[PDB]
Design a binder for this molecule. Structure first.
Ligand SMILES: [Ca+2]
Ligand SMILES: [Ca+2]
Ligand SMILES: [Ca+2]
Ligand SMILES: [Ca+2]
Ligand SMILES: [Mn+2]
Ligand SMILES: [Mn+2]
Ligand SMILES: [Mn+2]
Ligand SMILES: [Mn+2]
Lengths: 237, 237, 237, 237
């Protein structure tokens, strides 16, 4: 199967697969059963921003999520990603709905990867920033139900013509170019990712959440990865 | 055939297709017959740097090329690229040799594309910087004779095991991801490209040169585009 | 007196000093009498964005201004700034009111200056981005009526406790560090500036406007430069 | 006295103030007695590169130093800089010599500070990159023996006309603009610094080293801070 590292914004507590009894931010290393979570005071229908940072010196994957006029939630997990992920990866956004549902709308997404070598000319870099998505976004790979170009946004899960979210939906967007996250001469490897999201549900109990993920380059949506599996995992192991 | 816009560093004067009687920098719009050239005091075996700039407000494609301890050469041409190129493109480096030959070695290459919309969140961006090339550079498309990973460089044309350039060679490298250079809501579109190169020949008359180019995304090496055609053009029209 | 280069967003037509009979964007070289203007469909109370670009290859100072859901206005003027401005400058924002008035509120401001030399290690750069201004912004020089920290904004002209603009007010903010815009080894010098602004007036005829300017480092508010002189010029010559 | 946080490249072991018995990289928090060191295989007369990273989520100050064709040295120390440093600081480079001596030559220096707020428009940033230093570098504060413009380099300590280093010398360069490293609305604060250096001595035992430091804005060279005190500290406590 695929190799996955993800930061999850998990809107629905599935306590039988180790979720805490509240919406939470989590670090997922090859399992939907997060290695670390923190309470997340998710706001139905408010635009939020998530930040993800890592570097190969500290070997610590960290995330922060906030809303305007609100406190942040943060989570960190000590992991060496050179030991988890292959040398080349793709980076993406994933979302799902199940019998509970929500919009999984992405208004912006940026990513920066840097490899500094021991050469005097040391810096290797990739950066993209999306603030507008077009109907035909050729530098994204769209998987499952994901679409681009509605109000210049990326809709990771199915929305009817009237902004209403559909249940039992899964969709992903991967940046077209593979990303080099380890190189033999690199003395420092870093990455940062930012996305702004709008999770809106007509219901008191939205599901299931949004993840920023890093995968093997040929990564696809696992069968049956709607709902609690966030379009990342084939099962709940 | 392909649609090509290129800045050429043309090392060999072909006066029957309009080259001046010296090495020169030129702007090529859909023809190897440059729309503008400037004299270039090319240095056999010295590391050089070329810069290319454009923006959709000024509609002027400009290039500068220098060496350490030397004056620059510059050329500009008034062109609206929205009228020449499609909305999505690939960006690349091309080189050739013929019966005269040279190394077409790329030590570094960076590219930045920015689309600013009339949204308050206006900026869309792509950036890459290569200072080291690996044997397996998955974010480059290599065409014809181009290779990566010799001394951490990109060799656009065939070199023997002993750094010696081969004649009748053509090779290109395109960035894997397509680049969005026009968008309906963009109020300013800009791009800049930089590459450092080493053109070395055992001969007094090196050929044929290096080009930075922008093309339709499915662009390939035209048949018979060795030598004076720089791996860009099927003929000299 | 001071040496000034400015892009003006001029909200009030003073037809006796050459303004056109409408709000306009203009390029000012050492005179409030713009060298070039374009019609500007200014929107009372809407957040707008201005972009300013220049490079020493093209020697063309260009600006664009838009609002969400509106067309842009653009103006360009061929000028070599190496011939107008000294080698070191300060960059700033200026605004005024007179007997007619408006808020001159700056919500964000960014500036990037780059000097590329003919060295292999060629790039010299300055960049700042302000999205929040604090009550004590030590990296800004505030002149005249300018203040920082109200709603995290920069107020270039006097506002009462209730957001109401005061007449006969002039204020400027300069970035604390001097900026190097020419260097003897530079082969390309570029700069870009962006600011988002909110110009709001209880009146049908707001005055007087906002300017992005570049000056000698010791630049101060000229005496009597309220109203039509935009805090830039001592007189209307 | 001043408040100092520094990464030291300490070329001379002073074992009575806790140096290890070899050249080393260290993290200094308000004391020349490093909180953490690592062995550094310093190369007399070779150009080296140091990288320094920190963020307020991880609260870990990390450095790496290498040469071309050599392994890196790295050191990290868990510290919250919001608890050590004031909200506004200046960033600089410091070097010294004593009865043992070396050149303390800086060929390039870059710094990036970012404060991300919980606003949708969240990013505040400062960046500079120096690859060439001019005789009159108005955006640097030079203290003690530091000079700019010899071979386009920054010489932190006295060099005779013939590149020969002088003993008993101390010099610093601070970026002119104060840097905002904490803000009440910031959800993530990060900084990175890079400098390339050339430490050359006619002697088998060079002294005393180079430091990247962060200080109170009015920071000056302490009396008697030549040699082992690196121009940072008034004493060895
Ligand atoms: Ca869940
Ligand atoms: Ca030719
Ligand atoms: Ca006017
Ligand atoms: Ca020591
Ligand atoms: Mn969970
Ligand atoms: Mn030619
Ligand atoms: Mn005017
Ligand atoms: Mn020490």
């Amino acid at each position: 199967a695929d190799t996955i590292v993800a930061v999850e914004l998990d809107t629905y507590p599935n306590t039988d697969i180790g979720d805490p009894s509240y919406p939470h931010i989590g670090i997922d290393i090859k399992s939907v059963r997060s290695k670390k979570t923190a309470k997340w005071n998710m706001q139905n229908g408010k635009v939020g921003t998530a930040h993800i940072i890592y570097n190969s010196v500290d070997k610590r994957l960290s995330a922060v999520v906030s809303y305007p006029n609100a406190d942040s939630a943060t989570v960190s997990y000590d992991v060496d990603l050179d030991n988890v992920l292959p040398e080349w990866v793709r980076v993406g956004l994933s979302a799902s709905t199940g019998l509970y549902k929500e919009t999984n709308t992405i208004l912006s997404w940026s990513f920066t990867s840097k490899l500094k070598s021991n050469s005097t000319h040391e810096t290797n870099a990739l950066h993209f920033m999306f603030n507008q998505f077009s109907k035909d976004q050729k530098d994204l790979i769209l998987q499952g139900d994901a679409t681009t170009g509605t109000d210049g946004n990326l809709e990771l899960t199915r929305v009817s013509s009237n902004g209403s979210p559909q249940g039992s939906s899964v969709g992903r967007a991967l940046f077209y170019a593979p990303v080099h996250i380890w190189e033999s001469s690199a003395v420092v490897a870093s990455f940062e990712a930012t996305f702004t999201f709008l999770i809106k549900s007509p219901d008191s109990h939205p599901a299931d959440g949004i993840a920023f993920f890093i995968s093997n380059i040929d990564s696809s949506i696992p069968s049956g990865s709607t709902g609690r599996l966030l379009g990342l995992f084939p099962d709940a192991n």
